[PDB]
Design a protein around this nucleic acid. Structure first.
Ligand SMILES: [Mg+2]
Ligand SMILES: [Mg+2]
Ligand SMILES: [Mg+2]
Ligand SMILES: [Mg+2]
Ligand SMILES: [Mg+2]
Ligand SMILES: [Mg+2]
Ligand SMILES: [Mg+2]
Ligand SMILES: [Mg+2]
Ligand SMILES: [Mg+2]
Ligand SMILES: [Mg+2]
Ligand SMILES: [Mg+2]
Ligand SMILES: [Mg+2]
Ligand SMILES: [Mg+2]
Ligand SMILES: [Mg+2]
Ligand SMILES: [Mg+2]
Ligand SMILES: [Mg+2]
Ligand SMILES: [Mg+2]
Ligand SMILES: [Mg+2]
Ligand SMILES: [Mg+2]
Lengths: 88, 218, 129
RNA sequence: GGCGUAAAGCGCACGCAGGCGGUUUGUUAAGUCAGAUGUGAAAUCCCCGGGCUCAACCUGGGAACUGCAUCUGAUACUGGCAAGCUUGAGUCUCGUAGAGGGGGGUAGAAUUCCAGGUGUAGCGGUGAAAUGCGUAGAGAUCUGGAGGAAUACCGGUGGCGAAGGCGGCCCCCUGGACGAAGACUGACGCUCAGGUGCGAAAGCGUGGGGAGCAAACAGGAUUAGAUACCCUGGUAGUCCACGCCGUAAACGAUGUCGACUUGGAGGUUGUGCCCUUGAGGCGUGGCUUCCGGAGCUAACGCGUUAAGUCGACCGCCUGGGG
RNA sequence: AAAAUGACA
């Protein structure tokens, strides 16, 4: 469920500052880390319908942020989708 | 004039929030009745009353609750005015044409025991009238010396006498009312906040309003 | 979410007088302050205040000539979902001229009695009776 | 114009196109507003006019044809561009309450059945009664064993979930809400046609399981008949795994998202200060039941969780039967 | 326990 140490690593790797939590880059990374870890969970618990609703909120939220970045900084945005790997 | 300060009151935990500009707080989760705001408006109506009492306005005093009942007969019937010490017969003001007939019947009823029907006929039809006399004299008293509709009403409980106000509100009669923490300020245009259900408190009101009636006519 | 903040500003006045409150307070904006300057002119309300730095919060004062209120009918006319613009000869009339209608002409905020006597015209911000 | 009860809110959510969009500064001039230029055939319409003896009827001048295009010029609003701003929305740290979900185990009460021991003549059932069970030992009672389903007490208009709904105890995968103090991102927001997902119980398909209940069915009784209610039995089903179905009085008969507007009695759940002095007292956040003021309206009633005052989008309604 | 029904004006 992306514990604190599992989160304290991504925020520094993607964020611009040691305390830069909240920028568009780090927010997306913290979602794709939950999303691409929850692939294993729903491999086993397939009919976990109630949890799956929470994931579809994560996937939906991520696309909302990436649209905002795409309208803001094209070079920064297309750098982001490849240093993480998505958008196919 | 905050001379005594003996009627903090508070009447309850609940309230009608329409007296928010008339309250403070106390440690018992209950609302302190203002005495600083009370003083100026209180003497306004006394000044107003003296302006109307000089033209013989037939002041009416309404005290119905048991505790303050007797002191109304010590203020209204004391000087010249009228009281309703016991329950208010619904419609006594707007339905005057019917209470008028019953007051006239009373005047016969009292004299039906002076020189009429007390001993010259059967007690089942002579004494029973006195049972109707006693039911009347406390249910309809000092108003027996009236000559029509009054011009100034004076009430103590703005809630316990909320139906006497409406008849007065129905006509044009201005009224002085001693509202409380639980009371309603609207309807009555001459607001006098303060605790009511205390003999040491009512004496402050009645004893210091009947004086203004006294000075109006002289 | 709030989308017509002007329609919010008027409603504070409506409920402020229904509750018989002395004054109201709400966040400030340049169009709002211009609106409140107009109502300061026509005697609907007394002076106002715009104290605020990062939360500029306008603070009006409601007016009671008698026990009653003064702003009897204040309604939003050109809402965002349907905006209406009027021209110099078709300016709306409120209670045969006894009220006013606020028009934001090309030369700043104004009322239909001064824009009519200036040859101008614009969007009908609201009505105030 | 409406949508609690008269016809009318999709069962619930996610969401592309579309609609709408906080606050400041600059700039553009597309919407918008102001003038002119050109065009808007004549007549008919309308104002002041004239001629037939009046009128109907002809006729002169205006005004109107709300329009569309260009040229000038205004910049308050909307839209575009750019730079910010923190209030909206989201992220981070600490902690809280939970029948929220998926999977795997295990306990104890009871019912049924099976193998036995004492034990006698009835048991069971009804408004009465009969069917039925029993001398082949029934019913009652004690011991041992096997199975499936459901979790008494706590338990409460208590809690969680978007809705459907969720209830013994433990474990490990997992979702969302809440609060204090802080830091960051800086419009990233609301709504949603067509789409996508979920969606009680019953039913369906392929396999398992089957104690108790029990549609269908049978016998007894009631009744004028009784294809019923009552009684004795009893099949699918109820239970599990995996795929369907997509409907309910799926109801608060009340779409989602904001802001504003007197009060009481509680519950539950964080919490930050005096009086940690022991109760407590003071505060304030989130959910929730009841009564009620203004207001609303056909009345019932609703009422800070509005059906009150407004703003944005979405669905639906047009006499009853057919 | 049993207790069904009553043309229109
Ligand atoms: Mg999350
Ligand atoms: Mg209608
Ligand atoms: Mg209906
Ligand atoms: Mg619904
Ligand atoms: Mg749909
Ligand atoms: Mg704006
Ligand atoms: Mg233009
Ligand atoms: Mg023409
Ligand atoms: Mg002529
Ligand atoms: Mg702009
Ligand atoms: Mg939505
Ligand atoms: Mg089923
Ligand atoms: Mg089956
Ligand atoms: Mg049966
Ligand atoms: Mg339906
Ligand atoms: Mg339901
Ligand atoms: Mg419905
Ligand atoms: Mg209520
Ligand atoms: Mg027949």
């Amino acid at each position: 469920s992306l514990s604190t140490e599992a989160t304290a690593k991504i925020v520094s790797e993607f964020g611009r500052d040691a305390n830069d939590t909240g920028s568009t880059e780090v927010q997306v990374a913290l979602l794709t880390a939950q999303i691409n870890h929850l692939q294993g969970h729903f491999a086993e618990h397939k009919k976990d319908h109630h949890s799956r609703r929470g994931l579809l909120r994560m996937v939906s939220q991520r696309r909302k942020l990436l649209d905002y970045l795409k309208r803001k900084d094209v070079a920064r945005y297309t750098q982001l989708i490849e240093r993480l790997g998505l958008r196919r | 004039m905050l001379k005594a300060g003996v009627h903090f009151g508070h009447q309850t935990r609940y309230w009608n929030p329409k007296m928010k500009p008339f309250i403070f707080g106390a440690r018992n989760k209950v609302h302190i009745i203002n005495l600083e705001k009370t003083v100026p408006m209180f003497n306004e109506a006394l000044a107003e009353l003296n302006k109307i009492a000089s033209r013989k306005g037939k002041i009416l005093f309404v005290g119905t609750k048991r505790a303050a009942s007797e002191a109304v007969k010590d203020a209204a019937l004391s000087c010249d005015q009228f009281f309703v010490n016991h329950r208010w017969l619904g419609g006594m003001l707007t339905n005057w044409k019917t209470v008028r007939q019953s007051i006239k019947r009373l005047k016969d009823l009292e004299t039906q025991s002076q020189d009429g029907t007390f001993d010259k006929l059967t007690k089942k039809e002579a004494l029973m009238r006195t049972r109707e006399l006693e039911k009347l004299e406390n249910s309809l008293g000092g108003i027996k010396d009236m000559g029509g509709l009054p011009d100034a009403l004076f009430v103590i409980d703005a809630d316990h006498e909320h139906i006497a106000i409406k008849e007065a509100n129905n006509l044009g009669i201005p009224v002085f009312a001693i509202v409380d923490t639980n009371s309603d300020p609207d309807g009555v245009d001459f607001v006098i906040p303060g605790n009511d259900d205390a003999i040491r408190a009512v004496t402050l009101y009645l004893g210091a309003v009947a004086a203004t009636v006294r000075e109006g006519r002289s | 979410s709030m989308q017509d903040p002007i329609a919010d500003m008027l409603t504070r006045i409506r409920n402020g007088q229904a509750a018989n409150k002395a004054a109201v307070t709400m966040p400030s904006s340049k169009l709002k302050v211009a609106i409140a300057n107009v109502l300061k002119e026509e005697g609907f309300i007394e002076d106002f205040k715009v104290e605020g730095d990062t939360k500029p919060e306008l603070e009006l004062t409601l007016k009671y000539f008698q026990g009653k209120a003064v702003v009897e009918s204040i309604q939003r006319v050109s809402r965002p979902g349907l905006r209406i613009y009027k021209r110099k000869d078709e300016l709306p009339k409120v209670m045969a001229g006894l009220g006013i209608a606020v028009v934001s002409t090309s030369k700043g905020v104004m009322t239909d009695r001064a824009a009519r006597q200036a040859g101008l015209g614009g969007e009908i911000i609201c009505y105030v009776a």
